[PDB]
Amino acid sequence: RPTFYRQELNKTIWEVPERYQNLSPVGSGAYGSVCAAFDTKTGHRVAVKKLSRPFQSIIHAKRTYRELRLLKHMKHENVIGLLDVFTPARSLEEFNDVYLVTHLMGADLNNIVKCQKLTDDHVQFLIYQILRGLKYIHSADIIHRDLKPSNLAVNEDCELKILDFGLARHTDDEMTGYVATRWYRAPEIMLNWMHYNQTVDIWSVGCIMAELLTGRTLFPGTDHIDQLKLILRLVGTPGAELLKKISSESARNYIQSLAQMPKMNFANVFIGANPLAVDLLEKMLVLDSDKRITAAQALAHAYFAQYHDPDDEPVADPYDQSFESRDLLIDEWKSLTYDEVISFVPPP
Numbered sequence: 048r049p050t051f052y053r054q055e056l057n058k059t060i061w062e063v064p065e066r067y068q069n070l071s072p073v074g075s076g077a078y079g080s081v082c083a084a085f086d087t088k089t090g091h092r093v094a095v096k097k098l099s100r101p102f103q104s105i106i107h108a109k110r111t112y113r114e115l116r117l118l119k120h121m122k123h124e125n126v127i128g129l130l131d132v133f134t135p136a137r138s139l140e141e142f143n144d145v146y147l148v149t150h151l152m153g154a155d156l157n158n159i160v161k162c163q164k165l166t167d168d169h170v171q172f173l174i175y176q177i178l179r180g181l182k183y184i185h186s187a188d189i190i191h192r193d194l195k196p197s198n199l200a201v202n203e204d205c206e207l208k209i210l211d212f213g214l215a216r217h218t219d220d221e222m223t224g225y226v227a228t229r230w231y232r233a234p235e236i237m238l239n240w241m242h243y244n245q246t247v248d249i250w251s252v253g254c255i256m257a258e259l260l261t262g263r264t265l266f267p268g269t270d271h272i273d274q275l276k277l278i279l280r281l282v283g284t285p286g287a288e289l290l291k292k293i294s295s296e297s298a299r300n301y302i303q304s305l306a307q308m309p310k311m312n313f314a315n316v317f318i319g320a321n322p323l324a325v326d327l328l329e330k331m332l333v334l335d336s337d338k339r340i341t342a343a344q345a346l347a348h349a350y351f352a353q354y355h356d357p358d359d360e361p362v363a364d365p366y367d368q369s370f371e372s373r374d375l376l377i378d379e380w381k382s383l384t385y386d387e388v389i390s391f392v393p394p395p
């Protein structure tokens with residue numbers, strides 16, 4: 048057990064191992080209560096997150112367990128991973144706080160890139176890395192649900208990591224109005240058309256790729272309905288095949304109230320873009336999710352010929368998420384979380 052020291056940060060007392068020095072509050076709070084630090088064992092600048100009393104309810108206790116399980120599993124160059132997890136408690140009986148440590152992320156895609164279009168070579172490399180990480184995520188049967196520029200960390204060498212695992216689900220209010228947290232969502236999850244699956248994340252990648260090519264948001268809707276109208280103008284109104292798959296009777300009735308429209312010519316929307324990029328966008332931005340390209344298929348598309356290497360695009364170890372359908376009491380979720388803290392093994 049390391050020696051811990053105490054200091055007042057973010058309105059509470061933080062107690063951390065001596066290896067972490069120069070703690071300073073960082074960020075806006077979007078990912079929790081976070082400080083930047085220098086890790087003297089590894090030489091890295093790190094982010095340290097404190098979960099203060101996270102066993103206050105069944106919902107919070109299970110969410111804490113979920114975040115630790117997901118972060119402990121993710122081991123891929125293009126996905127956030129866990130450097131350390133610790134508690135100052137010496138036993139289960141005094142266990143109350145959890146701290147998580149990762150690499151410190153400087154910039155994201157949209158603080159760096161807002162209002163600006165990038166060169167085609169840059170677009171190839173950035174989208175390639177998103178798809179490489181997504182192939183890994185999907186091979187573990189995890190659905191991200193919230194890919195957007197603010198969740199993509201990027202360094203000076205254009206290297207990228209996917210963020211946002213195990214946090215609270217987004218609220219109705221967070222999704223209302225002229226807001227970036229809805230502009231990247233697939234129509235079937237935005238409007239609860241049907242039981243969705245991992246294909247929702249490929250729609251989001253298409254929206255991100257379009258924005259890197261043009262410098263502009265693809266579907267900047269002022270509300271859910273305005274956004275649906277922007278989507279259907281580009282990709283066309285649904286045919287009878289997809290209408291049958293919309294299990295919501297009320298949503299199906301609303302769709303039929305709209306005049307029918309054909310799919311637009313993407314070469315006349317994305318004027319001047321690499322024809323191979325136009326082709327890939329047509330395969331991602333398909334209304335019927337069953338027919339969208341997968342991450343593994345997209346890595347083999349000719350647009351990525353200068354980066355694709357099928358011997359260096361790994362998949363994940365199996366991820367048991369049977370806990371997600373299990374009902375337990377607060378103290379049982381707490382004991383499961385403690386076991387995962389004490390069993391952590393750091394990376395090489």
Ligand SMILES: Nc1nonc1N1CCCCC1
Pocket residue numbers: 078081094095096114118127147148149210211212213214
């Ligand atoms: N759970 C997370 N998803 O994205 N980022 C996350 N956290 C950031 C701060 C350090 C802990 C991990």
Ligand SMILES: [Cl-]
Pocket residue numbers: 049050064065066067
């Ligand atoms: Cl230490």
Ligand SMILES: [Cl-]
Pocket residue numbers: 134135136141142143144145
């Ligand atoms: Cl504690």
Ligand SMILES: [Cl-]
Pocket residue numbers: 157195196197198227
């Ligand atoms: Cl964003």
Ligand SMILES: [Cl-]
Pocket residue numbers: 365366367368
């Ligand atoms: Cl597992």
Ligand SMILES: [Mg+2]
Pocket residue numbers: 193211214217
């Ligand atoms: Mg999110």
